[model samples]
Target: VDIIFRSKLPDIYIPNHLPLHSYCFENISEFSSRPCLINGANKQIYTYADVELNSRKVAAGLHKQGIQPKDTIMILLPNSPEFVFAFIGASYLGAISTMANPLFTPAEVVKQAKASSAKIIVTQACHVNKVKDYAFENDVKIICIDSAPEGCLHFSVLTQANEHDIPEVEIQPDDVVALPYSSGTTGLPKGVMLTHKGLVTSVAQQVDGENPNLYIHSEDVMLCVLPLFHIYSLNSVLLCGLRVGAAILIMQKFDIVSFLELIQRYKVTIGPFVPPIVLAIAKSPMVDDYDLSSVRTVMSGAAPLGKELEDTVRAKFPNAKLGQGYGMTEAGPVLAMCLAFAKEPFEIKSGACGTVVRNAEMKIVDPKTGNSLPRNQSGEICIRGDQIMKGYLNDPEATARTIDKEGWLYTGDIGYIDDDDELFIVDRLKELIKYKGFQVAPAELEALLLNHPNISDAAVVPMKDEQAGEVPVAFVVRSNGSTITEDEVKDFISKQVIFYKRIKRVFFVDAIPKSPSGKILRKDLRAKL
Candidate 1:
């Protein structure tokens, strides 16, 4: 199939077949000496060759436990060596892997575990209790990292498998390789079924294509501060780094001091950061303490980062490329990556994620009519591409709702493209607040409030107003030491927009709950509020 996009990167080449373990092994020498995974906290380095070798060690380890092809395995951890070893390692044996966050509550873990029919779960000793409580109750096996309690299997047993002789297993390209969850654009989180082909194609569509603008140089080191359990980091950081032969510096948590120190020590080159971190780097006083010169590109995605903050961040990384990624978990996480930072020599991008990836077609559609809208129109973003999810796990009905009979995955996001072909994310499908006949977007207003000099972070939720039916109320976080009153903040926004657009009420909060991927967890906030 010959396909082309009017991209700055015309050399892009997408392969028909997806990448598999057997395939990765063939490219071992491409960047054999380059470190693939680096532990920022401990300065640990695992080369591309090292990652491949350890992944086999993990493969042999899982094989020893009688974990066969297509068997369900759950990997519950943040960004770490164990995560990579467990996920890709499971895929080595052709087994399907369902990734869950270590930060999930006990009930949350159980819900996912039982839902996936996960026979085995891998986690650190610290979080064992969460899974352990339901381990025997639900008749599942528990594999603990570092240590294992009574009646539990120790991860050490897998190390006993001969890495010298990994059992052979055949895997099809369309096999369900990794299952990560998504709340879609409007509902509770459900498992997203991703095939081996879906993932590899998406990776190659951006990183390996002939005009591969999403290139990662062998010498470039990526900061893996975002959680790997999330689709964005799992695909964009770890997997993309693997395919490109770049070094990854993994951070267990988000501490400003540690984040800066890693950059100073490792000469880290690529940063795939979220909105909160973007705000801190661009606005925080602590940024002056570190040398961020080694950074080649800094990507903001997962949530909206206002234009004001975007400009400030560009000022900090002026020498490096700057852009944003418009993604949702269900759409293979990355629908369209900004091209400004595409392969070197391409210019920096502004305002929207670069046009849809090569070979993929995007149609902005009217949700009301299910008809595709023409260029320069705001409508539900629908994607027709090879990188879409296989379907929702076990629920054909739910899958039917997301992907239509005509081969299009309706991304519940509401956005439009400009005459230049750049796609802009105006707001979310579910975040809209309806009052009488007017449509209000909380994320839009939240982005506006965040641009204020005094506001640190902000969230807007719908408050029932008898007269208006529903109104927008904001919750804001103050800068490190400044105090800003609600009335004063309200007055500021009031002057900028119309009466209905102005916030009706404001409240202060210490912090907002962001997901492992750095998206604001509005469900949690709405429930608590």
Candidate 2:
């Protein structure tokens, strides 16, 4: 018999049909004077009303640039206030906002730009030159927040556009608003079509109604150091904060001193962290140097946290409750959150991914036969709800493979629900690697590795690390007359990808073994690790 697990907390009312913009700012009046965005880089604060007006200006400007409803706007910038405005503004016009990591190479951004059919790319002045060539070649307009280059548009121009009432466009709840890319199942990254109804349901499931699954009170300040480009940060941190009218202390990047200083200065109440950051906080000697007594909750996600590490972090923030949330980019970015976020605290086991989110049905299925498993049995975790993505943009085949006709999105993650209904991730059946909660697709690195002049053949695999859940390590076969060291191979990939996606260890082999059909035998490589 199959047993499904649900949230221990009662299902709450989710305003699913509302457009993303209206839903996010529905209660802005409650905190109109409150700081909605605190830019740590410049110590500039944007109140709720300020964010709303700026977003309207952005919407008007985009409309002037010929961006119509259903158009795509690619935002490739770090965590900044402009990112918030551009994303919400795109929602105002019923246009899709596809966010890309600034760390991605020009080639990577080019692929996403082409895939999303983005007519405009909003990025920082520093990052403009990186993707400018690709944007120029594709005729995609560039809007830089810092300063406009010769061929690019300035963000000031957008903010200067009419800040009056934005034109009302008919936006359906089913309309896709955000297209965050992910390596669903297997292969290269593809755009995940997160819609208005879907994202609304996702945020509501976490922060709406009487007893939110992940509570974020108006007075609760969230540490927004996580990059907004990722779904975990975009949906949970930014969208959830906007919905609940919570203050977001935005950190441009994760710096030890600045991170602690912001928390102390703002008296941050909530901290949403990844495993690696948690490890640093627990192990860093400087953690004691800052006054983090104001932190009430420390929520970790993106990767699994061992019980030992959780205990250490718990000791670091004795006044705070530490918990982990399990999610995926395709799962509307959130599947389950720590039940500790409930109005009333619940006893939670360490390393548990909390309970299945409210208003959703989760079941474990046999990874081999596709049969549902009873509670306490490990299998593939599958979720069915309104929060799941509409589908992968422009790729119905991949979408169909991921979300079955029954609407259950196979998470490709192997986990089980305990008797208490807490979900624990045991393993991953997917080929993707998780480094410090960021996904490192093996195929993406393998393709880039092949670009190296000295490398002929390569296979990228995950190497377990204490800090990062899994680090990508490459097995390379050097070409004739090549004496490239391991550091050289690492640097070659590091320059093209982000820090998380960098290859840690390199093993030189004569050849990368493949199957008779030319498929990489990752199992053999796994044995080597």
Candidate 3:
């Protein structure tokens, strides 16, 4: 049977055929004087009008610097007001903003820069020297947000341009506005091209109409500590806040002490978090010392959090509702969000991934047979909507494998829809490991392990973890006469990669089994688990 599920909320009008900036700031008059963005570090505030004017000036600056429509601009900064300006500015100019992790190694950064064909990089001055040499090699222009060192342009120049000088460019609804990299089902990272229509549709589905799925208002100050490089934070936290006229409190990084203080001081109403952060809230003693009564709702996503932890948080914040959202970078980031956050809230199960979002359809299908299943049956989840990504950037083969002719995106996640129409994610059919919702590609880690002098052969695999959904562990074959320890192997990878991508454990092996086609038999490795 071809079973499909949809939102319990009535389908509202979706202004999807509009430019992202137009839809995001459409009703700007409602909160023109309200705080649009606040920097936690310095308590600096940018009102709606200020953000709008600065974004237009940035558009003018990009035009003056030869950035044309369809040009890709790489934004490599942490969570700050500058990120908000750069993204909206790119939107105004009909340019594509490709966000990259600032914590990524230089080599990792170069791969994305080359793939996106980015012409300019907007980053902090502290990261200038790291990417400076690569920028020169690729002839990519650098615009630093902080003080200008030699050979670098200042970000103030971009904002100093006259708003009237901004070029008037015709932007189509389907035009790609953001290019975020993700290893969808397999392999190394590939660009996911998100169109203006898709993003606008996604934000509206969450916040538009009388009964919003995630109720955020102009008076609500939402936390934005999560890295904007990831789509979840970019869409749900940042863009949704802008569209709903909610004040966004930006934090450069997550520190428990400072995070709690900021939430209390700013009187944050909505707490957007990942499983790890939620776990911290549930277990940390500091949570008791802080007054978090200001928070009305806590939204958790990125990875499946345990029900026990959710219950713990519920007990801590008795008045605040706790909920979960499920998403994929390719699925315009959000597929399901907790209905408990709706303007008229619904009774949701603790572990439910919410109902299918309005304007979209979700189904569960047999993984082995490629056939849809009935309600309450577990199978691979599939989504069809304008919210789904317009396929991977420049990777037609992968795009064909993901999105079918009927426009249904085959999400590699194994989940099911209950009779109540609520979605529940059970497992993943893909090899992509989620460490606190951050993707740690096994292939990328394996490639790095091969580059090690003491490692002759290596195969990286996901090991089940309670804290993080799953962590990457390596199976390594030692080189001749090599005396490297497990800690040494971990240190080598940790020095080059981000905190989450570091190999949690190492197991010495005689050989890594492979098929005749020379592919690591990941299934065999899973069997060993």
Candidate 4:
């Protein structure tokens, strides 16, 4: 018999049938005049009414540009008011928004754009060139936010249309809304199809109950320094914050000084951050000068936090309930949240990732036998719920491999539930490397490495890091007598991928250890590290 785990808090009713935009704004009347988004760079604030009206206007504008139900649009933007408008506008039209990192290399950006079959790409003036050629060749429209290039349309074209002009479109609960890419357990990045129902369920699970799993009222201010491109920030910060009418403070990038200043200035109440930021706060002497007493909830996700680091960071946020949340993109981004964040909070263990979220079932199963393990037994963690992803877009085989026929989604993480019902992650079974909460797929990097003429073979593995939770370092077998330097390999990869995915170190070896079937033994390489 299989043993399943669930949240200690009771499940609440979720209006999963409603469209995402409508569900998020269901209680807008109560706080229509309240602050919704505060732009950190310019101190410009958009109230709830302004946000709703602009979203509607943006919807009409997108329809004017020929977007319709089921069509896909790519959002290549940093965290900003425009990002919110574009995303909510897409929901209004039953259009799917696939968010991507704006700093991606041209090839990386084009790869996703082509794979997702994006009809329109919305980005800033500086990043337009990355996708201009591909967009031009593929008949994809480019809309620039800052300034329109020679061939691109201005963002005003989308924002300026009359809100009344929006066409009526029927949106189903299962219709795909957000398409964020993840490597899943292995391989190159693939789109994770998150539907309206899935997102609604996820938000409700976190903040909808009478005693919420995460409590943030309309008066609360949340920091959005983490990139909205990632699911952690998009779902937990932006979507969850919007659902509860919290004021979301938008920051395009993270700087230590700026982060502290914004928290003090806005009197930020909720900090949805990652381990690296938590480390920065703990290590920075400048934090002593800032007044962060207003913060009440500090949540870290996207990567694990050690007990030692957890204890160290606790002193920084004197008034905040500091904790970690465990998530995987395929698990609808959140499998567990810290229960200490709930309104009627539970006493929590220092390094625990809370309990399984309400309305979801989680199990730890033995990898070899595939039997569900009891409490305190470390194994591969799996979760099943309406909040999980529908599947990998267009890759049925991958979907089948991830989510079994019984509907359980296998998260390649090794963790266990203690007697207190709190979850603790012991290790990872996946091949993805996380550098400061950003995913760096070893398969993607290894493929790029093999393409080099001087590199005969390569294997990428995670190296424990202090600032970044983990960094990718490679073991390589050079082509005979080529003598390619470490900097040369790193430079080549840096040019092709984003900043975090760059290989940090290269080790010369005779041959990469492999199994009988010819799969690289990553454990053996990691052991060397």
Candidate 5:
């Protein structure tokens, strides 16, 4: 197999498959009047027409604000309707949109803000201070939604100003549209530079392909609780849903009772979540109290899902179909979606992520020889597709190292494709616990532990073991006011898995450290352990 990771992609196919702006152009009158997005926190609604016009107004407003094509803007808000408007507005002007997770601390925000060369920072009231820490230093202009400071500009006032048909830009297949950040294989977060064609192509890969995985009907209500700053939520839920004209229901934070109530009330057809939520629904005592009849499809991504837990969620939310999205931030993000239920059901081996997906080409190359490994053999999952980012922003050396000369993006996920082409990810390349020939993933244990009622967050990694090379160890976050003994946690996980996979050591921490995009910082954890 050719290195889809280093080779060039066919330029002819991308433009034909996706629109520069997929969501805004699907003939507004069709799903136009339908409620498209609800402000995650306040319950403010923006219909398809409302979002489209707002986006257009944003474009016109940006143009008037002297933001021409290629001007960078940073969106630092949570999963809100304004996030959609500003993102599309950037697309409208051919300017790139760089995202910052609202949960980011002060320094993290400044780092991303400086890296993207962002002249304007768009965020909500809560995140205002974080970005403000850098504003004075960088002369950054602040645009706040909901409420603004004395001198700061309000997003509503700006978007409502003018209606001008901004001239379309001469976009290249490699022109950056959305700048995403991730430590592709290792180290701190770097901006993964995604072009218009790359992002549009990735979106179309799922929505417009031959099999066209993850169908979003015009009437389908998508629960958009996955933080939009996350690539999984940005691509899979927001962009993909908007492309197919589905209603996006937003929530600021995950409250189990409130989430279930919204699903029932909105009759939500699709729910995009992370592993934590799946674990919650699977083990929570309050799940049986709600009627979650509206949810037909439930998607979990950003991390691996245990087959056992998926089964639990399936059993609990029996009526809702369950699946997973496997991706990394540098992937432009989704590499695959659970294809078992793609138009029809197909058997998936337990612990598999999904098929390689349509329009995406996958290969497992032996890291040492750089030789392609055949199906059913474990190796690094490399991809060549429209979904791969062009490079990392401002770091050409890192960019060159990531996307490579040809085109394939090397996914540092250790897995193999079976004979049937279904992909199974055992662990992240960097996170694997090597016990001579045995590889263990902390996620596997963490998934099992998070299912417990008393646990809030957890992390697992390898600690030195003289007898067996290395063994799994765990650190956990307890629910407020609850006490869990270290031995109880160790015994709890050991009971769930085999001996090699068992936790030999445990640390009870008040909190687990996470990166800007919510990835568990195993490096930091290892440092302390």
Candidate 6:
């Protein structure tokens, strides 16, 4: 028999049958005239009515441009009103939106586009060149949010379409809506298929209960500095913020000065951030110059924040409740959240990532024996609920390996629930590196490194970093009598991958430690770090 853990708060009714868009806008009437998307770049605000109408119009335009039910569209842009409009617009048409980092290399963008079979790509004029040739050759359409290039269509083409002209799409509960790529357990990035029901359940779990787990209301102002491409910001920040009709302040990038100004100017009430941002605020002496009293809730996720750092940052927010949430991309993103964030708050211990979320069951199992353990026994964490992903797109074998037949999605994390039902993460079984909340897959980098003529074999592993939390460093076996400096290897990788995925350091080794079966001994390399 398995010992399961549950939320201290009781489970509430979740209307997950509704589509993602409808569920988020179900209560729009109460705050239709209220500010919805506040563009921090230019101080432009969109009312709830404005966003809903624009989304409908964009949907109609997509249909006119040949989009149909179940078709895939790629969003390769930064945080902006257009991003939100394009995402919701796709939901309205029963289409899937696969979001990618705007800074990704052309090869990276094309790889995802081909894998997801994206029909249309929405992006800015500046980044159009990255996918121009491939998109044109593949007969894919390009829509730019800013000034259109020679062959690209302007975003106005979508937003200006007649809202009444939207096609009637019969969306089912299990239809995929958002396709965010994640490097789960140990591999390159793969699309995680999040369905309408799954997302609705996830949003409801966070903000819908009477005594909500993460309390935010129509009057709340949320800081959306985290990139929307990641599941943490997409589900918790965008989806959850929209469900509660909160004002979402969108920042295109993270600059300490601009971040401080927006919170002060908007009187921001809720802050959803990562460990690096929390560390910046705690360590920056400039924080003393700003007034952050309006911030009532300061929540951190995507990476663990140490208790000592958490305690230090608490002093900066004069009127805020500080806490952390634990999540993984494949676990429908959120496994547990801080109960201190609940409407009727609970007493919490430092370093705990709250209890298991309401409406879901979490069990810590012995990874080797496959038996569930009781409270205070650390093991691989697993979860089961309607909120988890349908599966990895087109990879049934991978899906089966990650999620057992009993429906438990194994999270490659080591954690435990205490007597008080609070969860504390102790270690990670996954080899993926977390660089300031961004994923750096070791296999992806190893593959790139091996392509060099001088490198015989390579293995990538994470090293501790103060600001980034973790950075990928590589161990290389040079080809016999070939001399390749560290800078040469670093420069080669920098030209091929994104900044975060670039290898920070290189160590020359005779051979990589491996098992008889030829599996790289990643733990041995990590121990060296």
User: Could you estimate the TM-score for every candidate?
Assistant: 0.80, 0.95, 0.96, 0.99, 0.79, 0.99
TM-score of 5: 0.79
| Cα lDDT tens digits for candidate 5, 1-529 | 5533221112224453334575335556777788888765677888888787888889888777777888899998877778888898888788888987676657667877888899888987777877776786777788998799755689986678565656666656667778876666644567888877777777776675334567777788898887777678888888888877888889887788888888878788888877667777877898888888777887777666666778887776667768777877778777877765455546666667777666667888877688888767778888877778877777788777766676777777788877766778865557766442233556556778889888889988777654444678888899887688888888887665545677888788888899999999887887787
Q: After superposition, how far is residue 53 of candidate 5 from its true place, in Å?
A: 0.6
Cα lDDT of model 3 by residue, 171-245, tens digit: 998899999999988888899999999999889889887899999888999999888999999999999998888
Ranking by lDDT: 6, 4, 3, 2, 1, 5
lDDT of 4 by residue, 126-187 (tens): 99889988888889999988999989999999888999998978899999999999999989
Candidate 1, residue 108: lDDT: 64
Error of 3 at 380 (Å): 0.9
Select the stronger candidate by TM-score from 1 and 4: 4
Summing lDDT over every window of 10 consecutive residues in candidate 6, give the lowest-scoring window.
304-313
Which residue pairs collide, candidate 3?
A: none
Q: Which segments of model 2 are wrong by more than 4 Å? A: 450-457, 477-488, 510-524
Per candidate, the number of residue pairs that clash is: 9, 0, 0, 0, 6, 0
For model 4, the local distance difference test gives: 0.93
Q: After superposition, how far is residue 472 of candidate 6 from its true place, in Å?
A: 0.3
State the TM-score for model 4.
Answer: 0.99
Winner of 1 and 6 under TM-score: 6
* Cα error, candidate 5, residue 315 (Å): 1.3
lDDT by residue (190-288, candidate 1, tens digit) is 778887778877777668765575767677889999888888888888877887778889999889889988888888889998867877787679888
Worst 10 residues of 1 by lDDT: 1-10
Q: Could you tell which candidate, 3 or 5, scores higher by lDDT? A: 3
